[PDB]
Amino acid sequence: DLSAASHRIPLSDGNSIPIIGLGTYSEPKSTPKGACATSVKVAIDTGYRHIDGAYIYQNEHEVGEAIREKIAEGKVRREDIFYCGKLWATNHVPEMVRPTLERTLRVLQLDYVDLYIIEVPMAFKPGDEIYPRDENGKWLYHKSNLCATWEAMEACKDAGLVKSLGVSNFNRRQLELILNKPGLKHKPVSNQVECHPYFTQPKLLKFCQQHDIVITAYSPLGTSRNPIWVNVSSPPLLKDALLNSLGKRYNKTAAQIVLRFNIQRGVVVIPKSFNLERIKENFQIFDFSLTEEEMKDIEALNKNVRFVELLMWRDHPEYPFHDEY
Ligand SMILES: NC(=O)c1ccc[n+]([C@@H]2O[C@H](COP(=O)([O-])OP(=O)(O)OC[C@H]3O[C@@H](n4cnc5c(N)ncnc54)[C@H](OP(=O)(O)O)[C@@H]3O)[C@@H](O)[C@H]2O)c1
Ligand SMILES: C[C@]12C=CC(=O)C=C1CC[C@@H]1[C@@H]2C(=O)C[C@@]2(C)[C@H]1CC[C@]2(O)/C(O)=C/O
């Protein structure tokens, strides 16, 4: 079915999305300049046709640099590349949405993005600081109004600035809000959330499928496990006994096993790697398939524990991780 040359799955709005993509977040201070650009280029050469990024990653300009060069050389046409950008918490004010998208378009130097999503359901105080906090370190929040923000996102698609609209880190309630919104124009086609063998998102996935919403699994390899923000209570996902055991069976790494797992269930994966060898390794997941029994055993690894909890914002009205899903 899915192959290296053809692995795009349909979105509810008529568009399609490559089931595998390259994630581009990397610790700014511990990441060499140009690393993201080089990686995106290698990814496209390897076969990737989906790049997931965000203005707040502070490297969106490198992403554009790489994409434009590949188009310029004729490696791919703009329509062959799928780029996803995100609207940060400090840009949820309706009037700020379009200008925020336009900024990203100017940074990437492209006419449009394939997918633009609300980064988090929580709104933070607008400004030049992506992490608002007063003198006491108290997080400066802002009253959220998802419906209004969405209408602003819908306007962007009406203007032809983005092909598809979606969300990220949205729970069932927040999704319903948009889905049941009076006079809804464009339903969200995707919800990007943490998803892997240790957090399979069983209920959220079923809900999203009822509405034809595709789930993009971020941190599909269990994250970089940076203690500064990652909950390390759970052991290294890639060190899992079963995942590695199944890997020996197909002569694949645990990383490849976990990526095959999600894409085989229709979940898009956006593994991040700025390493030449690992970028290639993560794409080699079309030359084999997991048996149903194996698929069920891997799913059974679910621990219901998030690597990305974002506890520092558990008090924000829109914190999405309080509910079961
Ligand atoms: N929307 C949201 O709220 C949200 C949140 C977090 C992340 N994301 C997106 O999701 C992407 C993926 O998640 P993530 O970066 O957190 O995590 P991840 O993709 O789960 O894991 C990345 C870590 O794994 C390493 N790695 C990559 N391939 C490997 C392989 N084959 N074997 C062993 N280690 C490997 C990477 O190091 P090397 O680079 O050295 O290979 C890096 O430290 C992000 O980069 C971003 O585009 C979205
Ligand atoms: C999840 C998150 C927000 C949405 C997104 O697309 C990607 C990321 C990955 C990096 C996270 C970021 C945050 O939410 C803020 C964090 C957690 C940052 C790493 C350190 C950080 O910048 C911090 O500690 C300041 O608050």
Swiss-Prot record:
It is found in: Cytoplasm. It comes from the Eukaryota. Keywords: Bile acid catabolism, Cytoplasm, Disease variant, Intrahepatic cholestasis, Lipid degradation, Lipid metabolism, NADP, Oxidoreductase, Steroid metabolism. Subject to inhibition by high substrate concentrations. Inhibited by testosterone concentrations above 10 uM. Inhibited by the primary and secondary bile acids chenodeoxycholic acid and ursodeoxycholic acid. SUPFAM superfamilies: NAD(P)-linked oxidoreductase (SSF51430). PROSITE patterns: ALDOKETO_REDUCTASE_1 (PS00798), ALDOKETO_REDUCTASE_2 (PS00062), ALDOKETO_REDUCTASE_3 (PS00063). NADP(+) binds at residues 21-25, 52, 168-169, 192, 218-223, 272-282. Its main location: cytoplasm. InterPro entries: AKR, AKR1D1, Aldo/ket_reductase_CS, NADP_OxRdtase_dom, NADP_OxRdtase_dom_sf. GO terms for molecular function: aldo-keto reductase (NADPH) activity; aldose reductase (NADPH) activity; Delta4-3-oxosteroid 5beta-reductase activity; ketosteroid monooxygenase activity; steroid binding; steroid dehydrogenase activity. The active site is at Y57. GO terms for cellular component: cytosol. Substrate binds at Y25, Y57, W88, E119, Y131, W229. Its EC number is 1.3.1.3. Highly expressed in liver. Expressed in testis and weakly in colon. It is an enzyme of class 1 (oxidoreductase). It catalyses: 5beta-cholestan-3-one + NADP(+) = cholest-4-en-3-one + NADPH + H(+); 4,5beta-dihydrocortisone + NADP(+) = cortisone + NADPH + H(+); cortisol + NADPH + H(+) = 5beta-dihydrocortisol + NADP(+); corticosterone + NADPH + H(+) = 5beta-dihydrocorticosterone + NADP(+). Gene3D superfamilies: NADP-dependent oxidoreductase domain (3.20.20.100). Optimum pH is 6. GO terms for biological process: androgen metabolic process; bile acid biosynthetic process; bile acid catabolic process; C21-steroid hormone metabolic process; cholesterol catabolic process; digestion. Catalyzes the stereospecific NADPH-dependent reduction of the C4-C5 double bond of bile acid intermediates and steroid hormones carrying a delta(4)-3-one structure to yield an A/B cis-ring junction. This cis-configuration is crucial for bile acid biosynthesis and plays important roles in steroid metabolism. Capable of reducing a broad range of delta-(4)-3-ketosteroids from C18 (such as, 17beta-hydroxyestr-4-en-3-one) to C27 (such as, 7alpha-hydroxycholest-4-en-3-one). Belongs to the aldo/keto reductase family. It is linked to Congenital bile acid synthesis defect 2: A condition characterized by jaundice, intrahepatic cholestasis and hepatic failure. Patients with this liver disease show absence or low levels of chenodeoxycholic acid and cholic acid in plasma and urine. This is Aldo-keto reductase family 1 member D1. It comes from Homo sapiens. The gene is AKR1D1.
